[PDB]
Every structure is written in structure tokens, then in C-alpha cells.
DNA sequence: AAAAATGCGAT
DNA sequence: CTAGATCGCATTTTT
DNA sequence: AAAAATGCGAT
DNA sequence: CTAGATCGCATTTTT
């Protein structure tokens, strides 16, 4: 890609290592991220330390873009990194230079943002309608298609702890593993520890 | 404000009475809307035909801008007329053209996809983590704020049905009223059908 | 050991 | 009435 | 009347 | 155990 490439160019770039945190929630925004390697986290938490996983983004993402439009304007999350991290970094002020030049750019970031609110509304939805078990049945779903997902011959492999399973889908750990048991009580899925196989 | 003067020169102006629908879920997306005059819910329904509304919108914004990014896209939810409406309209066509002669417009329309991004964002957090009562608690008050609610000796009050209050906050009629008979009995509020003043 | 993450029944 | 959450208790895990 | 919107207890 | 939802029944409302 002939665009981005003249993007990056402009940033700098930072690595994090997994688990470390990009962006702190509440703190004063005026800088832009790509990640250029490497996944991440978006959550917010409650009054009480509780997390809640708003998304994960990846490569090709923009992150810390939600401030550019509006002096003074707080980081709206906490951005966590799910794995090692390569991240291009920029100013508004830089990059709003860049727009002017190439307008293109924040063609790919409203993109981004317009992709975010869909499945944000989708987020939205899910809670409203839906169950827990029916919130669970569905991640297993999503994340047995990512490309982190193992082959196996009965399904897909994922691996993750309940603690995010609730954390994803907004029930608590002890709701997951319940909800789990009962899930290969009725052979669709099969768990032991952090280890699944969807059934499919 | 002379960019958006501009702008509006370039559309259509439609009017929609209140009650009726601007724009269909599931239906292809090539046209852009800027409400001119009046204000309206974007709402998405369940299997069952239940409906949740994600937010209300008003003069000056935009609707219908998701599918501007990324040809052969659907409506990603219903919006339907709250009150008599004066409505914008261009065609992502004609408007990308815009974008490209000025792209300060581009940047007031990323500007509302950013903060339509948080509202819905603290939204899940809502239903996350506060319990119904907090839920309507919390609408009551940002409603007693709005500019159509009117003054009283006790403080401000508000009308609306308690179906809508079960839409906002994502539960039922029947528990927004018993909510509301709770709060009241809390000398919090005081409700008589549709009419509620928010004590304060 | 470290450092977390559970598990399930019970209320 | 049923789905979830919070505690009570006993055991198992990645850094 | 039209056309909806309830209300609250009970399970 | 408690917050909500769904039904059972009886009455009240904006077009
Ligand atoms: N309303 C909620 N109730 C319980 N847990 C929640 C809620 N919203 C978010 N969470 C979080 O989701 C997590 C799921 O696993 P835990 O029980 O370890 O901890 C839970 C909380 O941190
Ligand atoms: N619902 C969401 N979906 C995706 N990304 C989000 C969401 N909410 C926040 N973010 C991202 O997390 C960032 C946190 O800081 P900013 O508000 O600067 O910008 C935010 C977005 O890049
Ligand atoms: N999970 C849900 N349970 C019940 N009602 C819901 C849910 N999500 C959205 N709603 C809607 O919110 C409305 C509130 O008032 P009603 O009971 O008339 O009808 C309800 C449904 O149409
Ligand atoms: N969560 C949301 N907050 C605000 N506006 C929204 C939200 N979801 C959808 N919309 C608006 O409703 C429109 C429905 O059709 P579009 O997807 O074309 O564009 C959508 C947005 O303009």
C-alpha cells in the first residue's frame, strides 16, 4: 500500500511488550496510534476494578484516534497489549498536517471509526437482547474463526481463560465455567482448563 | 457557519413527519442525511420485533454516514422521525466529491462518528455494569437536562412513556414501572402516566 | 515456588 | 418462576 | 370511539 | 438470595 506507507514514515515507533498498557483512560489525549504488529485490548472498568472488553484491534488499526476532534478531550478506555507490540505513533497536530496534504488518510480512519460504531451498536444489542448463554455460544463462535484458532478433528481450538469470557461478554467467572459445563453437558463444545474445542 | 452553508447548497431538503422512517435496517446504503430542523432515534430491533434505542439525534448531525466507506453496505439500523423533521440529503457519491474539494467537511462528520463512538462505548458499560434502577436513574437525569424539559417548582419535569424508558435502558415496561413507583416512593421523583418531575 | 485462576454448591 | 451474582470452601495453574 | 399504553401481583 | 421477565387481569389514554 502506497498511502500508509508515507504514514508511517511520519511516526515513530514504539514496541510494548504483552500485558504492558498503551493508553490511560482519563489521561489527557493528542496522540495517534497504528499498530503496525501485534494485538490489543480496549476495556473500561467499573467503579470496582471490574473490566468489560469493548474490542480487540489489530494490525492495520488505529487506536487513541477518539480525541483528535476536539481540544482537550480524555482517552475514553484503557488500551491494554494482548501480545508483543509494534505500534507507529503521531501526533493530531502532526497528523492533522497530513490530512491537509493527503485527505485520504482520515478517509481510512473514519473507515475505522465507522467499522467500530457497527459492531459497538452490535455490542450494544447483544446485552440487550440476548442471554449469557447466548453471548458465550456466540464468542466461542467468533473467536473459533479468528486466525489464532487451532485446527483439531472434531472443530476448532481456541484457548482462553473464563475470567475474559467474562469479561467479553459481560457475566462473571463463575457464570462462564457454569454456562461452560453445560455447553459440553450438551456435546456442542468440549472444555478442559483454558483449552476448547467448538464442536463443528 | 460558512463550510456546512456551503454544504446543505449541495443537497435536497426532504421533510419527514413525525412517527414516520428516514431509514430502513438491511437496506443498501448510498445516500448521507444532516438533520436540518427536528430530532430522531436510531434504534434496532430483536428477532421478536422488541426495539432498542442506541441514541437520539438532532440538529446539526448526521445520519446514515456508516456505508459511506465501504461500497455495497446495509443500514445498520431503523431511524425514525421523534418529531417533524426538515431533513439534508446528498449521495455518498456527490458528498465524496465534497470531501475532496474541502475536507474540513470530512472532519465534522468524523467529528460525530468520534463522539457518537464514546456515548455508545460508556452505553455497554451501562448495561455492563449498573443495574436497571441505576440505568433509568441515570436517563431520568440526563433527560430532566435535555432543552425540552420544562421547569418546575421542584424541579424539572419531563413526559415520556415508560415503554420508551424500557427502549433506553434496556428493559421492560413492567419493570420501568415498578422502578418508578420505587424512586417516587423514595421521594425521588413523582410520576403520574407519561408526566415524571425529576426532584432536585 | 510464584502468581493467578478457578470450581461448584449454596443462598 | 428462572437467570445471575456473591460467598463459602477446596484445588490448580503461567511468570 | 380510536389506538395504545398500562398496572401490579403473581410465578 | 435478589433482580427481572412473563402472564394473569382490570383500566386508562393520544390519533
Ligand atoms: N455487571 C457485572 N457483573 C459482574 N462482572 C462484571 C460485570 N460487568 C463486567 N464484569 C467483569 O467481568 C468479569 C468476568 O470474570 P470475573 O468474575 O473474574 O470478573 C468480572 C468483572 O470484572
Ligand atoms: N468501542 C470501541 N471500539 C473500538 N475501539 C474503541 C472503543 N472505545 C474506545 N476505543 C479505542 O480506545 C481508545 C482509547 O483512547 P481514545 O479515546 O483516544 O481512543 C479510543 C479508541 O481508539
Ligand atoms: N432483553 C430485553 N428484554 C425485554 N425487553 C427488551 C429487551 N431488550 C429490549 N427490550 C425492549 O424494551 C422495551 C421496553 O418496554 P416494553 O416492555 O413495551 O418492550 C420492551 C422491548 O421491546
Ligand atoms: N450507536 C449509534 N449511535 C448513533 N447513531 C447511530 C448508531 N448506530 C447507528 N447510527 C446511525 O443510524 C444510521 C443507520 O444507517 P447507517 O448505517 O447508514 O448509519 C447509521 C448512523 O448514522
Redesign the interface.
Known sequence: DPTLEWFLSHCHIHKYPSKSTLIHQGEKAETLYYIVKGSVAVL?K??EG?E?I?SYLNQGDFIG??????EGQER??WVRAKTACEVAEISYKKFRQL??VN?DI??R???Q??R???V??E???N???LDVTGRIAQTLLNLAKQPDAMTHPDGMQIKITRQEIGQIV?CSRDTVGRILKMLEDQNLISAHGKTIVVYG
Chains 1, 2 share one sequence.
Do not use: H, N, W, Y
Open positions: 473500561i467499573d467503579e471490574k468489560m469493548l484516534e477518539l480525541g483528535l476532534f476536539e475514553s478506555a490530512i491537509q485527505p482520515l478517509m480512519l473514519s473507515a471509526m465507522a467500530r460504531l457497527q459497538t451498536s455490542k450494544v444489542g446485552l440487550a437482547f459481560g
